[PDB]
Paper text:
One type of enzyme involved in this process is membrane-bound glycosidase, which cleaves the PG sugar backbone. Lytic transglycosyl­ase (LT), anchored to the cytoplasmic membrane, is a representative glycosidase enzyme that catalyzes nonhydrolytic cleavage of the β-1,4 glycosidic bond between MurNAc and GlcNAc to produce muropeptide products containing a 1,6-anhydro-MurNAc (anhMurNAc) end [Fig. 1(a)]. In a previous study, [name] was characterized as the terminase responsible for achieving PG integration into the cell wall through cleavage of the newly synthesized glycan strand. [name] consists of three domains: an N-terminal TMD, a predicted PG-binding domain and a C-terminal [name] ([name]) catalytic domain.
To obtain a soluble protein for studying the structure of maMltG, we constructed an N-terminal truncated version of the [name] expression vector, in which the N-terminal 84 residues of [name] (i.e. the TMD) were removed. The purified maMltG protein was crystallized and the 2.2 Å high-resolution crystal structure of maMltG was solved using the MR phasing method. A single maMltG molecule was identified in the asymmetric crystallographic unit. Thus, we believe that maMltG exists as a monomer in solution based on the SEC and MALS results. However, there is a huge structural discrepancy in the various locations of the PG-binding domain, indicating structural plasticity between the two domains of the [name] family.
Author numbering: 1 to 344
The structure:
Amino acid sequence: VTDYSGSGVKDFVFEVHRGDTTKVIGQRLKDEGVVATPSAFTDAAAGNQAIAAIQPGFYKLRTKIAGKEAVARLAEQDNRVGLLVIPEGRQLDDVSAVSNGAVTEGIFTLIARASCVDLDGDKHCVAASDLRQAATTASQGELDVPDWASNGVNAVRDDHRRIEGLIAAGRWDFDPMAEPEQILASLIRESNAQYQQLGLLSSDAAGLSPYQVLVVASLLQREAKPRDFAKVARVVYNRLAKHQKLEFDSTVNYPLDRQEVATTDEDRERKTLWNTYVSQGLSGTPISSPSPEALQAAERPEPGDWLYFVTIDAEGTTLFTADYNEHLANIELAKKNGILDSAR
């Protein structure tokens, strides 16, 4: 049957849909002018495991090519485009290390990098600043902000940080040729489905909204090691109940876009929507994209009366207590064991 020869005509982005079989992909490849007949694709794909296991997503292909060439291009990992990984605890912005270490790239930078497609020579990317602007100004309906987050987003005006926490840690696909608003919206929709699957909307923890649970998880992700998440969650709720400020360093560092570092009394005094040295209560928005385990801890805090915690040694032991004098003793223990500076 008819099957194209030669090197093709035009590079473009092709989407494999969820539920597409090899046969259906062959039909769609014919309809988009990639292969001359569907069986040109399916014959060449027979017994190919890369094609059999192909994932829904976006793929750089070329028009008017041979079936075996279409198969090779689809099976080549490098032609995958709009595939994004957001590691746990990332922010929207890049975060500098004043610890003398390297920059930590944020979600905008990672989306932009994931968006790049080489089309007939032209490298085509969405720019991080365009994603940031769309986060700053697009309407909630345009970003598909979920209902449980609507009021939290609304209280933060003309700041991209209004959508913090809404793009979850995980692995996502997005159309690299769509507008910045639609890219952000699809990410937020996929994240909302994951958050639902991870229990964010169906939690029975008394007196907490889903948005508040997300905020707590984002704090835990930045302040504690995974082993301690559940206990730190209890500390947070105990302090909220006793109207004691959280005094989390990560809430000071978050808007300065800087990594885990000690904070001065000057920094702790700056009034922001997030600073928990200044104000009682939770941060106004999440301060990071939390891991699934931080979410589970925020939903199911370990029972206990602790109000204080500090890491005291090299192996990461963390002592929790409800007694302030014991907490002072544990702080000094961390200083003698070398973990914490003798003076701030």
